[PDB]
């Protein structure tokens, strides 16, 4: 098979398909070289990112439900990472 070309497959989902995924403490530290909260290093918090279908991060929300709601509120169609 391989039904699509690489560009088509990377594009696939435009313009509205986004996925929502946990942010690990590792990404948090990269985004904030001048300092993060200790809470960001704990399991007690799990921030979520909403990402375009080609991987580009659109937004960071406090949790999964907020990420899902934020995406719907901006006319996107969110899906999970399985």
């Amino acid at each position: 098979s391989r039904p699509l070309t690489s560009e088509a497959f990377a594009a696939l989902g435009a313009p509205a398909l986004v996925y929502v995924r946990p942010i690990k403490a590792a990404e948090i530290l990269a985004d904030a070289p001048e300092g993060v909260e200790d809470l960001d290093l704990s399991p007690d918090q799990t921030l979520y990112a909403v990402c375009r279908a080609d991987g580009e991060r659109l937004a960071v929300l406090i949790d999964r439900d907020t990420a899902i709601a934020a995406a719907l509120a901006h006319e996107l169609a969110p899906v999970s990472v399985h």
Binding site: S1, R2, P3, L4, S6, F9, A10, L12, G13, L17, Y19, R21, P22, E27, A49, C51, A53, D54, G55, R57, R64, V79, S80, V81, H82
Partner: protein, 203 residues
Amino acid sequence: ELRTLPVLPLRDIVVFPHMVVPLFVGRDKSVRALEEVMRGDKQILLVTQKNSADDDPAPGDIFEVGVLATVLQLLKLPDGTVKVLVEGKARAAVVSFTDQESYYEAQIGEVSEDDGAGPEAEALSRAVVEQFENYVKLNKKVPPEALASIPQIAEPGKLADSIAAHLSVKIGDKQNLLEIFDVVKRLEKVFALMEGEISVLQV
């Protein structure tokens, strides 16, 4: 017969046989299941989890019927999420999960489907097609491709699964349709689900 293969638990969707679906795969164990399958015959078990909130479901929290699928196409995105286009091939009973802690793995049985051909199967297919034509006026998110192709599906079981995929119904209703192996019963359920105002017929 019986086979062991790696599993990908789905958070919040059900993939039917013959559906082709893009998926993003981002949990550690799911990613590892996928890497495994891609070094091999490219085939995985899709099975839906009972609760979409659960991040690390256990076997008791995953349904027991799923779909054997083939990975058609794969792209690792820069953030590590794996974008994959999968194709459901066949319903699969889950016998049990193995002992593997790197990733979920399971033994799966083939399923037989009650099929065929009284005035019933026949009238139900035509009725479900007709109902589907009405249903999509009330649900404008069904792609126009599916509006053209679904009226042409000749095999009742395939017809039921294709409509099932397009219904705006809860996860549990989709998983229930996956578990109905009798095709006449399945078409009857898809008909009922498409009813806009509960029939006076079931009170």
